[PDB]
Write a protein that binds this DNA or RNA. Structure first.
Ligand SMILES: [Zn+2]
Ligand SMILES: [Zn+2]
Ligand SMILES: [Zn+2]
Ligand SMILES: [Zn+2]
Lengths: 87, 85
DNA sequence: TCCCACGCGTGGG
DNA sequence: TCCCACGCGTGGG
């Protein structure tokens, strides 16, 4: 059953929310803006895939590298300090 | 602009690689398996979106949490030893 | 409800 | 046919 019809192209859809997003293919409406870069998308899931992989993934990869490095510097300092005070 | 043709459904395509992956929709071929859960995909980019979000992001979050914890304990052995000093 | 995932067309490198 | 990103159909929960 496809009870929801687009009045522009007359295509029917099984879901009303899918009819709503489909209509944006005609209107060009992009309600969802990425908070990091500002790129606009027609649907929230399109914004999510974009942000997850284009931003979150590399930010977390960079963070891991950064912490490994900070932790290495701190360990070096802790080792030095330990000798200055004994241990 | 669509010089390639699928001989199963007669659809025309702009590119040879796109014709190739399209044919997989008819044959059911899924060459790409996710190394983490084993799920199969027709294309590498399908496998990538799945793996990146379903497995990798959670993994990275855990890693960052773990490293942040080690960091916090080290920034503590330091403020401390410098007190002994 | 309507986010989320996935399939798959299709451009770029 | 390689890798990838994004649009957009559409079911699951
Ligand atoms: Zn329409
Ligand atoms: Zn963005
Ligand atoms: Zn075909
Ligand atoms: Zn997987």
């Amino acid at each position: 059953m496809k009870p929801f019809q687009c009045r522009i192209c007359m295509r029917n859809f099984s879901r009303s929310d899918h009819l709503t997003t489909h209509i944006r293919t005609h209107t060009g409406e992009k309600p969802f803006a990425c908070d990091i870069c500002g790129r606009k998308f027609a649907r929230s899931d399109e914004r999510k895939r974009h942000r997850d992989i284009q931003h979150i993934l590399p930010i977390l990869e960079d963070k891991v590298e950064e912490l490994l490095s900070k932790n290495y510097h701190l360990e070096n300092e802790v080792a030095r300090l330990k000798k200055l005070v004994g241990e």
